[PDB]
Each structure stands twice: as structure tokens, then as C-alpha cells.
Amino acid sequence: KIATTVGEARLSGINYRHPDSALVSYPVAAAAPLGRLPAGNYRIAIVGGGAGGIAALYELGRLAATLPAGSGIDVQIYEADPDSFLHDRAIKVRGLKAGRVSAALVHNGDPASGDTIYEVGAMRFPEIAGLTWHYASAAFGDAAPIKVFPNPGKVPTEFVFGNRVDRYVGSDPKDWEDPDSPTLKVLGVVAGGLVGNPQGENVAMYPIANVDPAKIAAILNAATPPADALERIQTKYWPEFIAQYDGLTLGAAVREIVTVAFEKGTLPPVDGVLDVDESISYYVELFGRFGFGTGGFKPLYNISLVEMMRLILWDYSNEYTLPVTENVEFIRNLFLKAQNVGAGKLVVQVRQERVANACHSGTASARAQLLSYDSHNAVHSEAYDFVILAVPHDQLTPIVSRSGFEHAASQNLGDAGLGLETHTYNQVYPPLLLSDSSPAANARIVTAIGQLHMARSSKVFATVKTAALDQPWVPQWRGEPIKAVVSDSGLAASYVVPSPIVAPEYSSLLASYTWEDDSTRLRHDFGLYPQNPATETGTADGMYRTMVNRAYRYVKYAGASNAQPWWFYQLLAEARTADRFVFDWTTNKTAGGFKLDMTGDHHQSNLCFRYHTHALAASLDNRFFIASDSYSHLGGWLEGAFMSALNAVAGLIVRANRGDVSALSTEARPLVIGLRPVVKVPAA
Amino acid sequence: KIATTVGEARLSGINYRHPDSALVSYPVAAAAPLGRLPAGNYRIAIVGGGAGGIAALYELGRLAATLPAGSGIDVQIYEADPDSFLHDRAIKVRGLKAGRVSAALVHNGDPASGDTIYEVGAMRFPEIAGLTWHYASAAFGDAAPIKVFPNPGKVPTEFVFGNRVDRYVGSDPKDWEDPDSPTLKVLGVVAGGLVGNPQGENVAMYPIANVDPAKIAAILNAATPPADALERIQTKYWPEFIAQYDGLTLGAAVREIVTVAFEKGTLPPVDGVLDVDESISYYVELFGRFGFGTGGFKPLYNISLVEMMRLILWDYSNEYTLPVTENVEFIRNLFLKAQNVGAGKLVVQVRQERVANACHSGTASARAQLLSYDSHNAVHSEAYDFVILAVPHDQLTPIVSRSGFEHAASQNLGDAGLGLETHTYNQVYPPLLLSDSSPAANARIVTAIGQLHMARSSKVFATVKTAALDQPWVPQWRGEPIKAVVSDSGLAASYVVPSPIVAPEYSSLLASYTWEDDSTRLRHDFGLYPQNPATETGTADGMYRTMVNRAYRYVKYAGASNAQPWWFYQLLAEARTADRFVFDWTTNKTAGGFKLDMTGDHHQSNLCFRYHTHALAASLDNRFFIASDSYSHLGGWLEGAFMSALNAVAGLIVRANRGDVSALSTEARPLVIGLRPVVKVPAA
Numbered sequence A, B: 001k002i003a004t005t006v007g008e009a010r011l012s013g014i015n016y017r018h019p020d021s022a023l024v025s026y027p028v029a030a031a032a033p034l035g036r037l038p039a040g041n042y043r044i045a046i047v048g049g050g051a052g053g054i055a056a057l058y059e060l061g062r063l064a065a066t067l068p069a070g071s072g073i074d075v076q077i078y079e080a081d082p083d084s085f086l087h088d089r090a091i092k093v094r095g096l097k098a099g100r101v102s103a104a105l106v107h108n109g110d111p112a113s114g115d116t117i118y119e120v121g122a123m124r125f126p127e128i129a130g131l132t133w134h135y136a137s138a139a140f141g142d143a144a145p146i147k148v149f150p151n152p153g154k155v156p157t158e159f160v161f162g163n164r165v166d167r168y169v170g171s172d173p174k175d176w177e178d179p180d181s182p183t184l185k186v187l188g189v190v191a192g193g194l195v196g197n198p199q200g201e202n203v204a205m206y207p208i209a210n211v212d213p214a215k216i217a218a219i220l221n222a223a224t225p226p227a228d229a230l231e232r233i234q235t236k237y238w239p240e241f242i243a244q245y246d247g248l249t250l251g252a253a254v255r256e257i258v259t260v261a262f263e264k265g266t267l268p269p270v271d272g273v274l275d276v277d278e279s280i281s282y283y284v285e286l287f288g289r290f291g292f293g294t295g296g297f298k299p300l301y302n303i304s305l306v307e308m309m310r311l312i313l314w315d316y317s318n319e320y321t322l323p324v325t326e327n328v329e330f331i332r333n334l335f336l337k338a339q340n341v342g343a344g345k346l347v348v349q350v351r352q353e354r355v356a357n358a359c360h361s362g363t364a365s366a367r368a369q370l371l372s373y374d375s376h377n378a379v380h381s382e383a384y385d386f387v388i389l390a391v392p393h394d395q396l397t398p399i400v401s402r403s404g405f406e407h408a409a410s411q412n413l414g415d416a417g418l419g420l421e422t423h424t425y426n427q428v429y430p431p432l433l434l435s436d437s438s439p440a441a442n443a444r445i446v447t448a449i450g451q452l453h454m455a456r457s458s459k460v461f462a463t464v465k466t467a468a469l470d471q472p473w474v475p476q477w478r479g480e481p482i483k484a485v486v487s488d489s490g491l492a493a494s495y496v497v498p499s500p501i502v503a504p505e506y507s508s509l510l511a512s513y514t515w516e517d518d519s520t521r522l523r524h525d526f527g528l529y530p531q532n533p534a535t536e537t538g539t540a541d542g543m544y545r546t547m548v549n550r551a552y553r554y555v556k557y558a559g560a561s562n563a564q565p566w567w568f569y570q571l572l573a574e575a576r577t578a579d580r581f582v583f584d585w586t587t588n589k590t591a592g593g594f595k596l597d598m599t600g601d602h603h604q605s606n607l608c609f610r611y612h613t614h615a616l617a618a619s620l621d622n623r624f625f626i627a628s629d630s631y632s633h634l635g636g637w638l639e640g641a642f643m644s645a646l647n648a649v650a651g652l653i654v655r656a657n658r659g660d661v662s663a664l665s666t667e668a669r670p671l672v673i674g675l676r677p678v679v680k681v682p683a684a
């Protein structure tokens, strides 16, 4: 039941509704242009040329094509990253980034004849990511082939935690080297306790609407559910799950599940020597390192259960690749498609400028101001009709938080502490304008944004001959070498990914992909930040040797007499010297990889997710929208960036129509009216 | 009621027992040597010359002095930090570090006539930190003066969160600029809910033994508690608190408390425009930025409620300075006193070497092996009778985790991935040897240590003339300038601390002291890692300007209609150009600042805290003890490092006496026997 084309994946998830937006399938909303605009010549800015900004541009292009003769849309896209694809028409990165969709091309002096690609950011795409596949179809066509991402368990995998080793594929004990493994037993207990059963008895510990989450997932993914059922999930049952469990961490939930299983006798004493609490703790930590299909979630144990449950409902781990050499091609293709679809009515200019401030000011028709600096620090100011701020939360903070929270007669905005030139704005209001009357409403949105949690992440890469996998010391599973390794060595998760530039001679050795504390623990060894090498011609050899040295561990295998150094040390050492690499998202200007919500964070991220509903308040006249995975309930996924873009453009349409929701398509209207409004007064 | 000398602080906390060790006052246990050793000539290693290693050394000195003629203790202390005081027997750091007790001396070319000191690590010491003050008396005498640390609220303070500004000193509303402040209301709500009342009705939401924590604190601190109270807390009531609440975060607890208060009407809707969940969220986040007396605990909201409760019981925020110019002097003095107290029976040698591996091996008397590398990267191997591993958990992991979990015929240990020379050990057992028969037991301790949470932290410093605070642009409150600023600007917490080298001409401008995500968000701007400048003669001017720029915010005050750039911008910009600085503990080899326990982490930290009880199993030939704040229930305090050292030495004494607890003094026995053992042995 494996999808083989973009269209197959697209259709698989076309109906899926997420539980915070249960009244709408975003792919259905996105099928036709989102609405209509009054006649006019619009001047719009998009800050950020990542997935969110480019999806927003595409939707604007679709809108532009519907405008009558004499009307049109001009977009200024601001993109500060010198390596963005937008500024481009050994390890090469120049022109190979679209924000956090970021490739590194390994070559020997001719980039048109490379060895492999490192996917430094996004790399694996859930089957049920329906908006992602909708845009992949726009970019590449339904016919384009996709592959199963070689996740732990999708390819032969070695797992190591403490004294436990496993070698496996999937979850059928027939496919495990040790079918009696305690690791597979704890997986079944934790899956049972978190997901439960789609049919029959409810066995999950944390029900939604009094039933196992599996049963709710089937309703969220139906073509014709109850309408009544979707509204009840939206307004009653998911809010009640949040009220109950938003204060419970994933790690706490795992321990609750394991405790009950241990008391029932479903899980036996470990070694039968450990006492009750040591056994339970061992199982919690074993599951922590093993995970849900993408490696250990131990480092993610502080997320809310609500956040994990979103991923459970989505079947997040069932992932595919894109029909590309480099994932940045997706975003580049969407940018080109935006310009094509605008059919002459969309004009786009790219600015290599960093936006420092946004506000509303003045008394002219265009009041949405952006203050920016070019690559030699010269200041620029421009006013727009509407602005989409398509940057993640730590990048948005300085832009929206330094103007105060209410009317100001005059402000000199800009990066004064840097020594840079300021600009005087008059009759100034905050850009994220939720009230004409409330500074507190304006402060709530800003303070929420600034306190969202950006998960930390790093990726260590090297280039290895694929034939290294055929060495006698590389274990096999039914003749196929092990190609994923999940471990407590400090490396966390490692993958030997065939080169997409092609059986390929080379593989990308993702030696370590870490989250959260696992990333923190390595960071002292990276040497140069955010990228080692910082140059095209360097190699991060010293850094990488510290990773090889973390793999230099004596690993005992069952039946063997004595431990020997781990074979994976030998594999890591087979990578060539040149082109060793690390990228640390934490010391990138994103200040991490992507939003993941902690306990209590729902209320902050959900405010952001609903922000575009300000467009219902007609007299407010707020011209700023936000578009990033940080303003979604899928931080860490293109799906989140894309959903937030959709929200932003939908809201822009309602604002352009002075609060009239009838200007949205029938299918798009729920993007705005299916959420709780962010402005209670005035109504609309 | 304010302590004014070391002795006054020492006596104030001499009886306090922490709830995970409630049967014993560590200062009372430490009043005499901890026990006796059989006659002999002991070879002991201490890995690490920080507070834990040096306190362990002092206690070994006290023991050595009791040995008969012909007996003695030889200690090899391994210390890899080239800036340690142990190797020294514009911004200067050389010789001014004792691990995370770390001074930076600001001078103008003569280090004997400096301007100020930056306390880069430890800087403020709770009154009731009884072991800390016990050792401070050994180092300085009871008569030595101390001062109240100028925490937010101890000095005039400005607090900024969103649109809210408060200026205050203390918790008496008469000395708040706005006695009707919502900040003061939420602080009272959260105090009532978490701490409650020492007398009368119980009002707290999370009771211990069915009463308010305030009542338990008083018991724990009593010279003469009621009969059975400490045992019942240790075995029943504190375990029951953990069972109930270790799965609840601090942020979750705050929200529960605020929700009840909001429903009761104690906290009103924020203004007329916010809905219920918005107002609740506002108060949670307002309290988050304000804190408990040491600045906002929002970044610490993921800690377990259990962990916060330990700090509540301890009255942790009521803190003092040491009688020093630089805090490192404390540890230096304790090292010298260790040698003096040994009475010529303790010999100490310092090795400027990094330990890479520990194990048990061979058949000789001294079986505890350490593999190390000197400053030329040459390998060294040495065997000892006993070893104290006095390094925090991320530094300990490579030393204890790479040898497997059971007997090995031979292992070639060392940093082979780095290309460094290995050493062959034969008949090898892991160093942290909990079992002769259970690899899982051995794995539990290793995996626990490797998964403890190291909180992230950074400090940004500059030098400013103290007279800057007398300028008309610096606000005065109750007769003094503002000297503490707690803000959501990104700086988190800022302090203008008078130089200790002296009223002083200069002050240390601690521009930003951040924890956890607050630190993550800054890290991309630090420039050089872990320290900018990396040289004595440089200045982190570019970095600091990014901090000044975070302060370039328009702040509306009640006292002026036209908001202006925050006054604190101007103060930060008043710092001189030379000697601007940041230290990032995360990119230091500690991989962060100090342990703070997440939900669930008790199970791992408490295993480490109790590890020294292995000495009870006489048939188990385990020669290794651990000594750091990582292995305590006071990560982030010298008190934790000192408690762990006391544990380590107590366990060493029992092991050296082949399991005989009577070799501990009457007052020190409970250090071992008051805890649940990590090995099962017969009663009594």
C-alpha cells in the first residue's frame, strides 16, 4: 500500500484534517484560487523566500490571474539569505537554499557533476501531508515518482540502547533478529497506550471523544465523515483533550503507560534483577531511544502529549522523498510556477535585504511599512498595501516587538544598536495589530511569538562510497546491509542515504541527526558555527573525528563471547576525508530547527495559528499576516509552513474585502471561519 | 535577620536537610571526619578539580590525618582545563577557573590592579546552603563578611513583559510604583499556590504530607524535628509527592494555579478585550518572566514541579556573596586547606591531563584504571585503589560508557576516533559496576548519566563606570538607581554589579544572563565560542552591539506620553568599548551550565545521587565513585557538588572497609544508610 508517485501520495492525504483545524481539508481549500480581490493595482511584500513565503506567492499568483484587465499585483519578496535560490537566478551551498529546505552539493570542482547531496534541512515527507503533496503536484506533476524514505525500520536497522542491541525491519517479529526482543515489546505497549486500535476495544490510555486516537484519525481522514463529527472534534473533543493533557509531557505519558503495563505483567522485570522502578525507568528510556519510526523521541520527551498526538493522528512517520536531486528544487519550481500562473498580472521583484522592522504608519493609502538593510547595510523603507511576514518566530521577534503596543506619534525605527541608520515613522501602530484600544491584545500576540519553542537540531554529514556497505563487518538483514542506526552513542540517528545524483557510487553518510539535548551535547565539538566547513573547499575533519570517536565503543552482541569495537565506528571511518560537514540550526539565524510545543505552549502557538482571523474585524484594518511553520500545529514540517501560508493569503483576501468572508471560495471559507476568532470585539 | 558573616550564614542552614536526603544534615555529617580507613597506603585519583573534586580532596585530607604512622593517602588530581587555578601555582581568565566557578579579570595591562571581575559561573549563594557555608568557613573563617546578592527585588528593579512595566523593591506593595500591579497579584497567587503558609490554614495546591510546603520547610530546617518526621518525609511523603507530580512541569503547575485563581476572580480579565484562555495565558507568561527572586523562570518551565519544589523548600532565592574578590578563591583556599588538614598524610599531585576512559581491569591490587592524554596528546595509564569521578554528566559519559556493560577479555581503550593512542586492558569490567551479573544494571547507571539534562546558559558582560547609574536618564526608585532589569527583550536578566576590587569606580554590567531557550535564542550572535573574545586583548564589540540592539525598543511608561527608546539601551551603550564579553556554557566542554531535571528525570538523577550505596555490596568489587552537582538534587549549586562529594567519600570509606558501615561516623552513616540502596543486600 506503498505510494509510488506524487499523485498517489497526494490522493492519500487529500481529505485529512488536523484536529486544530478539523473543519477544513487544506488540500481541498487550495484546489481552486482561494477567493477574489476587488479591482486594483496592489503592492504587497512577502518577507522571506522559504516554503511559507513561496507558497504565499503562488497563491497570490493564482489570485492575480483572476483580476480584471487593468488590475494586478506587485510583490516585493525580501530574502536576506545570500545563499537563497532567489539570488542565483568541495561543498557548494550557494543558490541551494530555500530557508530550511537546504542542500549541500558535494563535488570535485565541477558542480554539474557532483558526488552526492546533503539534505541539511527538510528531507522526509509524510504520506498524509496532503498540502505538501498538492504543491508537489503543482511543481512536478502527479506522475512523478517518489521513494520510501529509508527511516529506521524501513530499511535494515541497528538499534543500540545501553546493553540492548536489535537488528530489524518494521514491526513484525518475523523481521527482527530477536523476535522476543524487549524493545519490540515496549513498542507494542507504548503504541497500544498512545494510539490504540482503529476497531474493537479501546485500549489507549489517553482517549479523544472517549475512544482510541486511532479511531479519531480514521474520522479526520474520511471523505464524508460526520460534519457533526468534525465540528464536535473541533469545538468539544480536541479542546477537551488539550484542557486535560496540555500540561502532560510525552515523557510523563510514556512512563504512565509503561507503569500500568508493568503492574499488569505485560512487561516483565528487566534482567529480573532490577527493582520495579528501575525496570519501569529502563523501559521508558529504551522506548525513548527507539521511537515511533524516525528514531528516538527521548530528546522530544518534553513536548506536550497534545503535540505528539497531532503526529500520531497524522501517521507522521510513514514518509517519502520528492522527485528531485535537491529538495530546494521544489521551492524553486513553486516560485517559477507562481510567476507562470499569475499570467502577466503578477510582477515579482526580489530584494536581498534583511527586514529589521515592520509597522503601520502615516496617513497614505499604503500604510504597511518595512524597514530593511541591504548587504552593505544601507537602509531602505517601503510602504505596502499588505505584508506577509513569512519568517519563523525568532526571526519575526525583532521585526514586530520593538515598536511598543499602541499608537505612537513618532518613532525612529531600525537597528540603532548595530550603528545602522534609523527611519522616522509618524502616527505609528504595531504591525501585528489586534486592537485599536488594547495594548494587551497587541502585547499578547508579540509575547506569544517570542516565547514559542524552537527545537534545536544539527546534522553531521560525510561522503562515503556506497560499496562500503558491502564490507564484511557491515551486518546484513536477509542479504541487505544495515543503512540506518539508532543509538545512544551521542550520534542519536544515522543514515547511509544513496546519492540522488545517479546504483550510485556515493552515499550521503548522515552520521548524526540530533534534536534538543542530543544536539546540545555535541555542539562544543562543531568548531565553526553554524557551518563547518564555513568555506566551499574546507572539511570539518576534526569535528567529524569526534563523531567517529563517539562510535568507538565496545558493543556486545548476543551469542558472541566478547565485545569488539562497534562496526559502525569502522563505517564512519570509511567516509572520505574531504567534505566532512556539520550544520547547526541553533547557531543559524533561525535560532534552531523548527517549532515544537512544550507543555502550555498550545495557547501561544494556537494564537499564532488563528492570527489571520483578524481580517474579520473590518475597522481594525490590519495589513500584516504571518506565514511559517512557527505559526502552525505542524512545526518541523513543510505542511505547517504551507498551512500557515494558506491561512495568511485567506486572511489577506478577507482584509482586502474589508471583512467580507464571501470573497473566499466556498471551500476556502473555513480557513477563516472554522477557527475561534482572535478579535472578540469587534465581531464578525 | 540578614546574615552578615560566613558564620551567620553557616549557622542559619546548619540543620537543613533536603527532601531526598531528609534523614541527614550534610553540615552535621561533615563536622568531623566522615569515618575511618584501615591502615594502608592508598592510591586514589580524583578526576576533576572543581568544587566536587576539591571538596572530596578536603574530606580525604580529614581522613588521612587520622591514619597511623606509616599509612597515608596519595591523590592524583586530573584537571584538563588549562585555565584552572591548579595549573597556576584586557580580560584575564588564566588561573581564575575552578570548573564552573569561573572569574574573568578586567584590567588595563596590570592584572594586580584590575577594574572589575566578571563572575562567569557561580555567583550567588543561598543562605541555607549549609554545606556551602560550612566549607566557606573552612576557607575563610566564620568572621568573614558577606553581602546580600543584588537580585531583582533586593535592589530597585525594572521588570518588562509585553506592555507591562513595573519598578519595585521587595514584595511590599508600598514600594512598588504601581501597588495595583497585576504582576504583584500573580506573584501572590503563585506563592499561595506553590508555597502556602507556614502557619494556620493550608492553601497550597500541591501539598506534601497533606500540608503546605512552607510547613515542611520548617520541619526540614528544624534543629530538633518531631520524632519520626524526617523518616516519614524520606520514605513516605516525599516519595508520594514525586509519584504524584514528577510528571507535571513547572509551567503546567503555574497554569493550573492561575486557572483556579482566574475562575475564583482573584485575577481579572486582563483588560476588557482578552478571552478567558488569553487572560490565563497572559498571567502565566507574566509570572514566567517575573520569577521567584532570581529573574524569570519561564525558560525553566519544563523542569519538573519536584525540582522547583526542592528550591522552594530551600528558600533558594535568599542569597549572598562570598568574602572574596573572585569566587575561585573559595575553591583555591579549600584545596590548600585540604593539604593542611591532611597533616602530612595526604600527598597530592596535579596532572594536566584529560581522562578519556575508566575501567576495572587486571588482577593487581589497584584495579581501577584511568586512561588519559596530556597536553602533547600522549597517552598515559594509571591504576588506583579508588577513583572519584568529579566531572559533570556530559564530561563523564565518554569516560564510563564506551567499555560495555559486562566482562570483556580485552579492550583497546582510548580516543581512537581522534587518532590518539589506545591502551590494552585485560579482564575488563565497566567502571560504574553495579553488578557482577546484570548488564542491565550496569547499563542503567550509564544510560542515566548520559541522559541527564544540562541546562543551557550564557552570560554577556561589559565594564561600566558606576557613576553611569547617577545620570538623569537612569531611573531612581526609593532613593537608589535601578540596578537589576528583568525583561522579555531577549536579555532576560541584567545586573549592574559593583566591582569587588575596592565605592568602586567600576561595575560589572551583566547585560544578559540567560537560561535554556533564552540562551538558545542569543547564541547565533556570540561570534566566537565558548568565549568572545578568545584572546586577552580583544573585545566582543560586535556581539555586544547585538545585545544593545535588542534593548533598542520603544517602551511606554506611565510617566510620559511620548514613548522613547528604553533607557536601558542608553545604559548598555554606556559600557566602555574594551572588555565586552560573552561566555557560552553550552559550547564549553560541559555542554551547558548545570543539571536541571525535566519531568521523569528524578529516576535518573536519583539513581546517580544514590550510586555510592554500591559500597554496601561487599562481594562487588567497585572502586569508582562520582562527585558533581550532576549527581545531586541541587544541580546549579555548589551545594549539589559538595553534597555529591560527601556522598562519594562516604561510599569510598564503606568500600575501603569492605562493606562495613560502622566505619562511618555516627553522624555520617546516614549519608549511605538513609537512602534506598542501588544494590540489594541483607538487612542490618
Ligand SMILES: Cc1cc2nc3c(=O)[nH]c(=O)nc-3n(C[C@H](O)[C@H](O)[C@H](O)COP(=O)(O)OP(=O)(O)OC[C@H]3O[C@@H](n4cnc5c(N)ncnc54)[C@H](O)[C@@H]3O)c2cc1C
Pocket: A047, A048, A049, A050, A051, A052, A053, A078, A079, A080, A081, A084, A098, A099, A100, A101, A120, A121, A122, A123, A124, A125, A126, A353, A354, A355, A356, A390, A391, A392, A395, A457, A458, A585, A590, A592, A593, A594, A627, A628, A629, A630, A635, A636, A637, A638, A639, A640, A641
Ligand atoms: C533540521 C530540520 C529538519 C527538517 N526536516 C523536515 C522534513 O524531513 N520534512 C518536512 O516536511 N519538513 C522538515 N523540516 C521543516 C521545514 O524545513 C520547514 O517547515 C519549512 O522549510 C519552513 O519554511 P518557513 O517558510 O516557515 O521558514 P524558513 O524556511 O525559515 O524560511 C524563512 C525565510 O525568510 C528569510 N528571512 C528570515 N528573516 C528575514 C528577514 N528579517 N528579512 C529577510 N529575509 C528573512 C530566511 O533567510 C528564509 O529564507 C525540517 C527543518 C529542519 C531545520
Ligand SMILES: Cc1cc2nc3c(=O)[nH]c(=O)nc-3n(C[C@H](O)[C@H](O)[C@H](O)COP(=O)(O)OP(=O)(O)OC[C@H]3O[C@@H](n4cnc5c(N)ncnc54)[C@H](O)[C@@H]3O)c2cc1C
Pocket: B047, B048, B049, B050, B051, B052, B053, B078, B079, B080, B081, B084, B098, B099, B100, B101, B120, B121, B122, B123, B124, B125, B126, B353, B354, B355, B356, B390, B391, B392, B395, B457, B458, B585, B590, B592, B593, B594, B627, B628, B629, B630, B635, B636, B637, B638, B639, B640, B641
Ligand atoms: C552559568 C552558571 C551559573 C551558576 N550559578 C551558581 C550560583 O550562583 N551559585 C551556586 O552555588 N552555583 C552556581 N553554579 C553551579 C556551580 O558552578 C557548580 O555546581 C559547581 O561549580 C560544579 O562543580 P563540579 O565539581 O560538579 O563540576 P565542574 O565545576 O564542572 O568541575 C569539573 C572539573 O573537571 C574538569 N574535567 C572535566 N572533564 C575532565 C576530564 N575528562 N579529565 C580531566 N579533567 C576534566 C573540568 O575542567 C573542571 O575543572 C553555576 C554554574 C554556572 C555554569
Ligand SMILES: O=C(O)CCc1ccccc1
Pocket: A124, A294, A594, A635, A636, A637
Ligand atoms: O526529522 C523529521 O522527521 C522532521 C522534523 C521533525 C522532527 C521531530 C518531530 C517533528 C518534526
Ligand SMILES: O=C(O)CCc1ccccc1
Pocket: B124, B294, B635, B636, B637
Ligand atoms: O543563577 C543561579 O541563581 C544559579 C543557577 C541556577 C539557576 C536556576 C535554577 C537553579 C540554579
